[PDB]
Structure formats: C-alpha cells, structure tokens
Amino acid sequence: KTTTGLEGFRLRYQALAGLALSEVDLTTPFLGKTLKAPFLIGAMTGGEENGERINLALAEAAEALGVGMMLGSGRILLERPEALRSFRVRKVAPKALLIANLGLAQLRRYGRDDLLRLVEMLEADALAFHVNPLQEAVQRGDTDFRGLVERLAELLPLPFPVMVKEVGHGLSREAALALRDLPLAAVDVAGAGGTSWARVELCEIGIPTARAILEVREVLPHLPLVASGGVYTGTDGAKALALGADLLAVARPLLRPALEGAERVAAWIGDYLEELRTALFAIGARNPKEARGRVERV
Amino acid sequence: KTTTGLEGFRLRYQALAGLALSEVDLTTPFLGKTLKAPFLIGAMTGGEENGERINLALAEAAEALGVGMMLGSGRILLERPEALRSFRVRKVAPKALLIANLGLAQLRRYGRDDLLRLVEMLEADALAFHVNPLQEAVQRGDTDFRGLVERLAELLPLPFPVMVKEVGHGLSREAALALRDLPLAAVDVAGAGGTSWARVELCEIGIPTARAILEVREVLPHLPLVASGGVYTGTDGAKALALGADLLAVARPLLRPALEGAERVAAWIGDYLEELRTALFAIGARNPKEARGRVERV
Amino acid sequence: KTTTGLEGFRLRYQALAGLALSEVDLTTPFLGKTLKAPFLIGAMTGGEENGERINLALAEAAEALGVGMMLGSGRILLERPEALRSFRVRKVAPKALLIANLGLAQLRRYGRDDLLRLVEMLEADALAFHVNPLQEAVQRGDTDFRGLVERLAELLPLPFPVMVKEVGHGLSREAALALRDLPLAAVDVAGAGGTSWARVELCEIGIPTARAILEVREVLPHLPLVASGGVYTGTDGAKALALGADLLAVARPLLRPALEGAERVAAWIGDYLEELRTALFAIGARNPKEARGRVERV
Amino acid sequence: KTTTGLEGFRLRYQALAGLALSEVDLTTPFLGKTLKAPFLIGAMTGGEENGERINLALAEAAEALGVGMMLGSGRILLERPEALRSFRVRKVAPKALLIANLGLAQLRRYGRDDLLRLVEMLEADALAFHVNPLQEAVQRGDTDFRGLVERLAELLPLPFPVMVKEVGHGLSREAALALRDLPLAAVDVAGAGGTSWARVELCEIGIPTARAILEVREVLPHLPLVASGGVYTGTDGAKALALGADLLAVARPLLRPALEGAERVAAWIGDYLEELRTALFAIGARNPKEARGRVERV
Numbered sequence A, B, C, D: 001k002t003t004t005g006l007e008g009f010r011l012r013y014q015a016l017a018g019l020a021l022s023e024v025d026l027t028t029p030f031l032g033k034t035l036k037a038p039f040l041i042g043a044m045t046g047g048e049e050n051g052e053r054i055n056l057a058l059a060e061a062a063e064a065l066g067v068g069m070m071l072g073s074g075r076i077l078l079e080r081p082e083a084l085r086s087f088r089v090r091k092v093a094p095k096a097l098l099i100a101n102l103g104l105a106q107l108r109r110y111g112r113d114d115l116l117r118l119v120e121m122l123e124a125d126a127l128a129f130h131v132n133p134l135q136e137a138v139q140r141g142d143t144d145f146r147g148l149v150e151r152l153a154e155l156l157p158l159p160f161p162v163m164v165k166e167v168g169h170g171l172s173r174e175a176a177l178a179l180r181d182l183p184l185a186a187v188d189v190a191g192a193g194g195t196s197w198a199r200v201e202l203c204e205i206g207i208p209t210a211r212a213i214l215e216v217r218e219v220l221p222h223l224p225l226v227a228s229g230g231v232y233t234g235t236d237g238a239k240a241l242a243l244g245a246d247l248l249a250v251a252r253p254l255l256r257p258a259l260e261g262a263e264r265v266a267a268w269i270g271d272y273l274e275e276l277r278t279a280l281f282a283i284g285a286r287n288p289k290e291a292r293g294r295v296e297r298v
C-alpha cells in the first residue's frame, strides 16, 4: 500500500543531449574496490537449507558482473562457528566487494575483536550494521536500542570501512543527523516501497525510499549513499541516482534467480544495468554521478 | 465516502531514535483518575435487550486494562429510574474512570439537581454532554439548540469534571470558540470518518476527525482532547495524538467483542494499545504527549 | 466525465451554532414575486406528446410548493399560435412565478412586440433568454451569435424582468463581463456537471457549475444568481448558495416525477428543500443568504 | 501509462463570445505553401507491402483537404533508388505540402548533395530530420548522437525549409535550447502520450506532449510549432494550440483509414477538423492563432 515514491518523479528525457550510448561509464569505486556498476546485491538470510546454495549463486554472479555483494547477518557466525561454510563465498568470488552484515543492536553483546573476527572469517572488505527498531519491535524481539550510536562512535575507527542501513522501513533525516559525526564509509537508506525484512497492521509505518534518499542526502551531502527498497528497475535506479543516491541495491527480486543458478542472477542484474545504462543515456548523463538532478516532480 | 483524514498523514518513523520499547509509558491521568493508557471506551446505547450485557463486558474490560469508559445517554435513567440496573456497572468496575452521558439539549428540561442525581446514581466520575444538531435534525427529533451553551455556562461549575462531545459528525473551530470560556475538563472531537450515531443523503456533512483535531487544538491549546470517530487502529491513534489529541476513544468496533464477553473486549483494546505502543516507539516518542508533531502530510 | 465541481467542497458543519431547525427561513423574493424557497423548476421542452402533460404537473407542483417555474422555449409559440395550450399553465398555477423562455439568437428574427406578445400569451412574469453557441454549433443549427448582446442592450428596458442563461455548458467570467452593463434582473449560470440540452466527443467543453458560480459572482456581485446544472441534492444546493448563488434550479431529474403527476414532482422538490433546510441548519445559516461562505475546499 | 497531459487542461468555453461558426478560418500558411487547416499527416513507414498503398491514400486525402503530409524516412531511398515508386506520391497529390523525412543521425553518412537529391526525387517541399536517441538506444541500433546538431548547423542554410522532430518521446526545453541558433523553419515536438515509433520497460521515459509544447514554446517563442503525439481529437488539437502550438500532426490513428482508401482517411481528418472548428468557435477564437491562452489548468 506504500510505494517508494519514485513513481512521483519523471526522468528528464533529452533527445538532443548529443551522447553516444557507448559513452556512458558505470564504473564506480566504492568501499575500497572499484565496481563495474553502482550496484550491490542486497543482504539476505532466508533459510539454512538453501542458505549456502543462494549465497554462491549471488557471489559468483557478482564476480562476473563486477558488482558488490552484501552478506546476510553474520550473527549466527559468532555463536555457531560451523555455519562458516554457509557464508564462505570467496571460493567462487575471489575479487568481488563483499560487505559483512550485523545488527547494530549487537554492539551491546559484541566488542571490537568480535567484529574483526567476523569480517576476517568471511574475508569481507567492509561491515554494514543494520538498525531496525520497528522490525524487532513488531517481532517482540530485542527492542532496546539505547546508546547504540554512541557505542558505534566509540568503536568506529575500525580497520575496514563501515556503513549503516535500515531494512525496508527507511532512514529519516533526523536519523541521518544521529549519524552525522560518525566516520562512516557509506549509508544504505533502505526505505519503504519494496519489501520489509519485517513483513517477510503496523507495516504502513516507514519512510518511502524516494523520501529517504532526499532527506538523508540533505543531511549527509558528501557521504556515499545506497538507494535500496523496491528500486527494482534500471529506470527506478536512475531516478534514485538523480534524487541523490550513488549506488543501488536490490535484494528480494534476486531470490528467484538465485535459486536457479548464477546464470539467472547474472542475467537479472544484466537487464537491470543495461536498462540503467539506457536511462542515463536518455537523460544526458555520461555516468551515475551526472544523473543528479535530471529528474522532476509530477 | 468520507474518511477521518488520518490517511493523509504519515507517522515519522525514527530508526535511530535510540529508545527501548520498554521505555514507552502510556500512563495518562484524565478527569481525576490515572489511566494506564490514553484510551476510553466510547459511549454506546444500542438495545434494551443486550444493554446491561454489553455495559458489563466493557466495564469489566476497562477495569482490567486500566482504561476509561463512557456510558450511553442516561436520559432514560432520569425518567425511568428502573433502567438503573442496566447501567449500574461499578459491581464489575469498582475503580475504573466512568463518564456519565447526556445530551446537551437536555439542559432545557433538566437542572442542577437532576445532573447531580444522574452521576450519583451511576456512581460516575464525570459527565459528558453530547451535542448533535445534525443527527437530531435528520431524525426530525428535537432540533432546538438555542441557548444551550449559555445554559451550560450558568451551571458549569459543578461538583465533578464536565466535558462536551459530538457523535461522529465532528466539532469545528468555531464550535471550539463557542466553548472557549467554559470551565470544561475536556472535549471529545468525535469527527466524521468512522460511524455516525445518526447513520446507525445528508450524511456527507460533518468534519473529518483529523480535521476536527487540528481545528479544536488550535482554539483550545491547553484543554485535554479526545480523538474519536473511526480512530480504529493503534497507528491511527498515534496519528491522532501527533495531530494534537491527548486521549483516544473507540465505540462501534467494540460492539462485536462486547457481545462475546469481557475477554474479547479486553483483547481488542489490548491489540490496539500494544499497536499504539509500537507506533510511539517507532516514532521516537516515550509517551502519548511526546507524539505531538511527529507526523507529516502526504 | 465532467462534474459540477461541488464535490470538491465541504459544507462547514456547525455542531454548536445554536439554531433551532424551525428558525431557518427559505422565503426568498425573486423577479417580482415572493417564493417560499429559492428554487426554480428548470426550463424543459421535450416532446409534443407529453408536452402539455408535463408542464401541468410541474406548474401545479410549483403552485403548491411556492416555487418558481421556467417554461421551455416559446419559440414555436411565435410561429405556431396553436401550440398555445401546450404551455398555457396558469389554469393550474394562477399565482406561481412563471418565466418565459427564448433563445437569445432569436433577437435577430424577433422584435419588441413579439417579446411582449410571448410573455403576455403565456401570462408569464419574466423572460429568460438562453444562449448556447456550443449546442447550436454541434447541432449544425444556427451558429451566428454576433451582436446578440448589443441587440438585447438596445431592447433591454422591457415591461418585465429579464434574465440570461446557458443550457448546461456554463457561463464564464468573461461571459459575465459581456453582460455587466445590461439591466438584467438575474442570471442563470447553467453549468456543466449535470445534463446538457445539447447531449440530450466535444461535450467535454464547458464550465463546471461550481466554477461558473464563482466566476460569475466575482463579476456580478450584486445581481441575483441562479445555480443550475447537476445541482441535484439539497446538500449540493447549499454548497451552490455558499459559493455565491441565490437560487437553485433543477431540470432533468424532474422529468421522471412529472410523468407521474404533480404529487410526485411535489414530493421530489419537497425532499430537496427539506434536505436543503437541514444543510443550512447544520451550517449555522438561518436562511439562503447566510449560507454564503460557509463552505471550504478539499 | 503516460498521457499527453492535455487532460489536465480545460478549454475556456465562451457562451457570449459573439462569433458565428462561419467566421472561424483555419487557413494557415506553413513551410512555403498555404494550408486549408493547421494539420499535417504524421510521418509513417510501416511495411513494404502496403507501403505504396498507404502513402497514396494519405497523399490523395491530403490533396483533397488542403492539408500537409510528412513522408516516412527516405533512408532506404538513398541506398535503394528502386523503392522510389513506393514514395512517389505527386501523381495523386500534385499541389499538397510534402515534407521529406530522414533521421538526424544520418548526417554522418550523408552530405548536402544527398539531401538535395532526396527531396528532389520525392518532389518534396521541405525536409524534416527526426532525432530519437531513446528509440535507437532501446533497439540497440545506432546510438552515436554526437555532433549531429553542429553537423546540421554547418549545412542548415539549405535550398528548402528544414525542421526537426522527435518520434513520440518528446523534445525538452534544453532540447529546444540546442536548436535555438539554427535557422530552422519549424519544430515538431512529438511527445509522449500517443504512440512511440519505438514501442511499435523503459518506455515510461519521455516528455508528455502538453509538457513539451509548453517547454519548447518558452525557448522558441517565434518559431512555428507542430504538436503531435496522441493529439487525436479536434478538442485536443485546440488545447495544443492554446498551449502554444501552431500546427497539429496525427500519425498512428490514420493507419486504419489509410488501408481503406483515401475516402476513409479524408473522412477521419474531416471529423477532426470540423471538431477543431467547433472548439475554436466555443473558445471565442476566430482562427488557430487566437486559440493561444484560452485554456486553464485542472
């Protein structure tokens, strides 16, 4: 019932922009490594049956496409060092940009050494902390979110790039304010409009992705932003970039192809990127950064 | 065809608000007694068959949940002192906050002693006068509403707290103006959007609850306000509170569970409050009062 | 596909207005006689079979309700003095306010004496000229509308009150401008939203009644205005009055009851007026004139 | 899913404008010849089977109605001088205004002499260059659009009038900017809302005709503009003219009648023009130029 808000925007088509489709470059460095496109495979947990199966389809595809990939919560990896193989993905993705995952609420039960061990076990290149009071609140799970930001601030200068994200309910402007002084490497807005890790009566609460991207960019103008949350088409990707994002992330829609092998995942991402490439071209932008502003309301 | 208007508002979700769900306190003193939640069971008459049956289900639940309860018009109690047992509810609700009810149009046929007798017979803690020109007008009932406010003003300083309410068609800003100098204890906006005591072609007339809450708060900034009229979910409750209300009231939806015993009523209110609690938490509010303003348009 | 626009307005319900339904007076003098309500039976031609039958049902009802009545084009009466009995209605409506009708385009084929003869034959109290370039244009009929206003200006000071009206496509503000210096007795806005005498691909052209009432009132603030064109309910009547009208007129919906006798017509008008009376009461207005402004957008 | 935007506008009906339908003159000179109406038959290619068949139905009709006609891309005529008869239409349309067609992207493979030969072979009166990066991009065709405008600027002073057009995706204001200094004879906005030569997931990109007409007129106030792209009714034609256009063009809808002979095409255009004539009349405009501004929003 709640959309991303991107349908309330129009890409500014430029018939006489004078570009050559081949001129558009999607190359975009992120978190230390250089990506072939401003795309990330969203974080996903799912089941322990298909777990390892899915991660390897995504990772392999990611490696082929030169795209980044966020792993699901390594939470269990701390307590169950045996579910290590379920995530170990470097075997099929040796050079890809991998981002470890963990709930920010875990900072009260895990210290620096645990964080280092997690990304080291996974051979990850960065760590993303997800914060989801709403989800954990509705699930009567762990609802104490006090001092987490201050707890991260203490730790923050870490040996690898660190980022923060929501899980489909979005980050508001005052949320970006709370992150303003932290030396983060990036932020994933993860707004409402697509799927909610919580859903998978109160699920009307949340911030539309389009809205989140605008609010967060205003507060953190210089930080690299990841637009995710129902940003399912290359066209929507371009809109997100024009509103202020730097990277796009897709999770849910990738489940289907992930169960049918890397070839299918790779194809999905491929349609999305080629579609993104046409949009930037039609927009007069020669790269993701140039898409900024080339969008209007109504 | 006419909504409360609350769908035109968005709760401002705060992922990084830094609260613990357990930190949100719903305790709110009202009309002399202290409630466990800012909730009231709306006034209802219905039939003489189920009459006593329903009141006792509501009252008992109210007592268990620490919530307030408005009784239906005690009109008949004045003329028929035998329908006394139909309302006598203290038997099952000894400490709850009970609010006697009576049409403001009755002030022309009843004096001070009658008002005192009514709340004393009911062992009520306050008296609420409902004013419904539209309803009585459409029902060709008693349509003379002259001098009622002046009549109440004369009486007003009474031995117990007194309030005024509509019945599903709402109170406008100029209505709040007419109540401005009266020493009332509270006001129930009772707007359009849910059910109309009148309905239960002209029923398009009326003021949307969301609209009424805004208008009345502007005129009576310091007075405690009750938002009612299709405020059926905890989410809608939070929106009402953020727009300016202090208490929520639900009537109609409570009929079903009231006919199936207190256990069912209590469960309904329970879902509503726990749902309200999540919303305040998701909003960054630690209590009803803090919800104020944490809502935006569109 | 095009509405009156009145659905985009909300009557301002006044719970504490302090009126008595019996206090609202609909009496409104118009074109020389005093009406019991600000209502007129719209002009209608139809067929020559039911012609006389319908006029007598309307006229009789009009007489009973103290309402005005506009006759259909007396055009044929000029050329065919035998269709005199088809309109002769005084037999059943001796004191009612009757308004003769004639296309403004006829001023080029008829002079003063013809106009006097027409209203005298009909025993009418006034003459209304309808101007419908669109309708006659679509019907490839007589489309020369040059100098008609100047032609009426020359004649205008007539022995009886004269007015101008459209036929369901509305009068714009610049239209009111063209009528500004004429000594007219009243104007019927007759906008789009209900039925079009033309309809009974281009019928999207026209001005919504709500829109016409606003535009014309702005240009002719002091002149009495008749709101017509899909103003089918008492509620819509009140809205029209609050937007600036002084009288309401309904045509089409009256056909059905007119074929079933005066008793049915009279009943229809009766529901409409009693419904109008409730609305003014709910609005805080004690008469049609006081309804002005008691309406808001959205 | 994307409309022209013309539905968001209302023609300003003028009941008292004082015109005679016969007073409205559609005569409008364009590209050197004088048209009986501000109408052009849009450019269409289609198939090689019906090719010649369709062109002759359109051309013949154009000749009868005194309207202009744009031919499909003469691209093939350059390489295949045998498909000359497929376009040769003067046989049935000796005096009509014919406009040769060619993709602007061809300027990199064709020089002045080739352009002269093309219009001379076709016995055309002007040349229209269509620019469609989006279409060619989605069709993985020729996507290099660099230096085309500068290439045309060099050539531009040609022996005949030259114009530029899109193909159903529209020209933006910055597009008009890129054409600002070129000595063009006219511009065809060809916006989104009707059909896209490309369509015949990314086809949401583009500029609504209504929007394009406004943007382009603002940048090129003095240049004659052609509104096309789902401008299928005379009413829509009038709206386009009131927004700023000078000529209307319809392509797709003309296919059906073109396959059933000139008589059918001629009839279609005939309904459209007579419908356009009524609209200007209803609007108070005595010709296409006077329609300007006689339209409002909402």
Ligand SMILES: Cc1cc2nc3c(=O)[nH]c(=O)nc-3n(C[C@H](O)[C@H](O)[C@H](O)COP(=O)(O)O)c2cc1C
Pocket (backbone or CB within 6 Å): A042, A043, A044, A045, A046, A071, A072, A073, A101, A102, A129, A130, A165, A166, A167, A168, A190, A191, A194, A195, A196, A197, A200, A228, A229, A230, A231, A249, A250, A251, A252, A253
């Ligand atoms: C099955 C499923 C599992 C998920 N697991 C995680 C997880 O472990 N960690 C995390 O930070 N987000 C997780 N998410 C959230 C996504 O990374 C992110 O919120 C995203 O915005 C939702 O997918 P998207 O909008 O394409 O649909 C999960 C989402 C889904 C649907």
Ligand SMILES: Cc1cc2nc3c(=O)[nH]c(=O)nc-3n(C[C@H](O)[C@H](O)[C@H](O)COP(=O)(O)O)c2cc1C
Pocket (backbone or CB within 6 Å): B042, B043, B044, B045, B046, B071, B072, B073, B101, B102, B129, B130, B165, B166, B167, B168, B190, B191, B194, B195, B196, B197, B200, B228, B229, B230, B231, B249, B250, B251, B252, B253
């Ligand atoms: C069956 C029924 C009986 C009611 N009886 C009373 C009554 O005696 N006194 C009163 O002040 N309001 C009465 N109301 C009005 C409600 O207290 C109040 O207007 C409310 O806003 C309508 O319920 P709510 O919006 O949840 O649905 C009654 C409403 C219903 C549906």
Ligand SMILES: Cc1cc2nc3c(=O)[nH]c(=O)nc-3n(C[C@H](O)[C@H](O)[C@H](O)COP(=O)(O)O)c2cc1C
Pocket (backbone or CB within 6 Å): C042, C043, C044, C045, C046, C071, C072, C073, C101, C102, C129, C130, C165, C166, C167, C168, C190, C191, C194, C195, C196, C197, C200, C228, C229, C230, C231, C249, C250, C251, C252, C253
């Ligand atoms: C069958 C029919 C006949 C009409 N005849 C006349 C007529 O003779 N003269 C006139 O001025 N208007 C005539 N009208 C127009 C109405 O008086 C007026 O335009 C009105 O706004 C249309 O009815 P209303 O909106 O309730 O539906 C006629 C309308 C209808 C439907």
Ligand SMILES: Cc1cc2nc3c(=O)[nH]c(=O)nc-3n(C[C@H](O)[C@H](O)[C@H](O)COP(=O)(O)O)c2cc1C
Pocket (backbone or CB within 6 Å): D042, D043, D044, D045, D046, D071, D072, D073, D101, D102, D129, D130, D165, D166, D167, D168, D190, D191, D194, D195, D196, D197, D200, D228, D229, D230, D231, D249, D250, D251, D252, D253
């Ligand atoms: C079958 C078809 C063939 C077309 N061929 C050409 C062409 O050769 N050259 C051109 O410039 N435009 C061509 N167009 C585009 C139209 O001239 C123009 O874009 C128009 O706006 C689309 O038709 P309209 O909106 O009525 O529907 C073609 C369109 C269609 C549907």
